[PDB]
Structures are given as C-alpha cells and as structure tokens.
C-alpha cells in the first residue's frame, strides 16, 4: 500500500541529509 509505505517514510523524513 502506498499510504502504508508513506507512514514508514514519515518516521524518517527529518533525516534526508
């Protein structure tokens, strides 16, 4: 699921660089 993976990304957005 798109929104499922999104929620995983959300946990670490604050780490991109």
């Amino acid at each position: 699921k798109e929104d499922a993976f999104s929620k995983l990304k959300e946990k670490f957005m604050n780490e991109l660089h």
Partner: nanobody
Amino acid sequence: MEVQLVESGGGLVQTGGSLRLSCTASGSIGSISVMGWYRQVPGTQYELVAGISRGGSTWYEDSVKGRFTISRDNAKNTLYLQMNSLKPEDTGMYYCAGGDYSDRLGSWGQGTQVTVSS
C-alpha cells in the same frame, strides 16, 4: 527500490512466547533509505509495527515498544524483527517493505503468518 524481499520466521506460538522474523533482499540492504515491518489482518490496513532508516534510526508502534526489536545485517543482506512477550493482538500476517523516498509503493514481499493463541 527494484529489489526483491522475502519474509520468514513466522509460526504459531503460545501467548507470552517469542519468535524472530527475517526478510532477505536480492539487492544490498544497507543502501535502502527506509525499511519496516507491517502487521495486517483482514479488513485492517497494513499497520507499521517497526521501521529502520538507512542511517540506523529505528521507530516502534507504542503497542510493541520494549517487546519487538528491528535490526539489519547489511553483511548478510537481511532484516530482522525479534518479537517477545507476544500477545494475541500481535496475531496477523507480517510483511517487510522498503525503498527510497522516490518510490511510490516500495518493495514488499509475500509476508509471514504470526499466530499467537493460548
């Protein structure tokens, strides 16, 4: 991320028991931005149980905090979920999934069934 993922390590255990999930990648696992484990039962959206960043950062649903433990072994291209003190509420099909932020879905995997009954 154009990598194949295959989960294993599930099974049937008594409430309070443990087991450990593995998910091996066809590609180099250390180079995937985000990865994580989802629990799903019929009629309920994939719930993210635990996640891990490429850096090594980890996240955990509150339910599973202190009980489950996500880790990665980039050497052996494998992701793990060490599950302890299992409740019946933890019953469900467990998937592992990962990708980079450009990926819309990410790579998933067929999943592995965890049943917890007493």
